[PDB]
Amino acid sequence: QTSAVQQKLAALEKSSGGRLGVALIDTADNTQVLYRGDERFPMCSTSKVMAAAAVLKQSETQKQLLNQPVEIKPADLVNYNPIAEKHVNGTMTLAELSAAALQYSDNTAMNKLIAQLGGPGGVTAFARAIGDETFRLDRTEPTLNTAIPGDPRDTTTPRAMAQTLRQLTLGHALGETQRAQLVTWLKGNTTGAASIRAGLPTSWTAGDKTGSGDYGTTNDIAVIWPQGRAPLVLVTYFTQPQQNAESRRDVLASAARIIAEGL
Numbered sequence: 001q002t003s004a005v006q007q008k009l010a011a012l013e014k015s016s017g018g019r020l021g022v023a024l025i026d027t028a029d030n031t032q033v034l035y036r037g038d039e040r041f042p043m044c045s046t047s048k049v050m051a052a053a054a055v056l057k058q059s060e061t062q063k064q065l066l067n068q069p070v071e072i073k074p075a076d077l078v079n080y081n082p083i084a085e086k087h088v089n090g091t092m093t094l095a096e097l098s099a100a101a102l103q104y105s106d107n108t109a110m111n112k113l114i115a116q117l118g119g120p121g122g123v124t125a126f127a128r129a130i131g132d133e134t135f136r137l138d139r140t141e142p143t144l145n146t147a148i149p150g151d152p153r154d155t156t157t158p159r160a161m162a163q164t165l166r167q168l169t170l171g172h173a174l175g176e177t178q179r180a181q182l183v184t185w186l187k188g189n190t191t192g193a194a195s196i197r198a199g200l201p202t203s204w205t206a207g208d209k210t211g212s213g214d215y216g217t218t219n220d221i222a223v224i225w226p227q228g229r230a231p232l233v234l235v236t237y238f239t240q241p242q243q244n245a246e247s248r249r250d251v252l253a254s255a256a257r258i259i260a261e262g263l
């Protein structure tokens with residue numbers, strides 16, 4: 001069946017020129033709304049949530065891990081690293097790297113998280129350990145953003161990512177202290193006001209992680225506390241046919257608005 005909300009999302013997608021993927025979980029009733037929910041999309045920086053969460057999981061059995069210093073060298077800098085470049089020839093802790101990755105989308109910080117986990121496959125391993133059979137991280141920053149149509153590397157589906165985000169932020173995939181820390185980090189994101197949150201009423205609060213990459217790939221994943229009801233988890237992925245396409249955060253905002261209006 002095709003719902004009114006799915007038809008609206010199809011209409012948005014048609015006018016956008018690209019390919020849109022949406023997954024909502026409403027924790028008021030556990031119901032879901034999906035649009036291309038089982039199609040793969042390049043994650044780009046939304047994968048930084050899984051890496052940060054994997055390090056939080058490791059910290060459950062090492063109380064001092066988040067205070068562990070990591071050397072930042074000139075050669076570690078990649079294409080976008082507004083926090084890490086301030087610490088070259090010094091150190092950042094794994095907490096500082098997690099915060100920088102999540103709240104500023106620092107790509108050097110992400111690479112240090114991936115290294116702590118033993119490479120991209122360590123992030124995938126953590127996904128599998130919390131019941132996500134779909135997620136795959138194959139590369140580091142910045143090549144995980146190539147976003148080539150048809151390429152499975154560094155992809156997931158909207159359905160899988162919404163489920164996982166729910167388990168991480170509202171469920172019990174992490175210990176309570178770690179879940180709270182993840183939520184605190186997401187709520188302090190600096191990059192999200194033009195994406196999902198732009199389509200929500202102002203009164204609502206949210207935490208989110210954006211992503212962007214080649215093929216005009218424009219993504220956001222969010223945990224949302226609407227006015228007067230139980231939290232939502234919402235994933236919005238968008239990708240375009242030309243490698244040099246421009247970002248379309250407005251499409252994510254529009255998808256979020258359709259979802260909000262359909263509640």
Ligand SMILES: *[B]([O])([O])[C]([N]C(=O)[C]C1=[C][C]=[C]S1)C1=[C]C(C([O])=O)=[C][C]=[C]1
Binds near residue numbers: 045143146
């Ligand atoms: B993250 O990987 O999406 C990250 N993207 C990039 O580094 C962009 C590209 C690299 C190579 C080809 S494209 C990133 C995300 C954000 C954000 O979420 O706002 C900001 C900066 C970098």
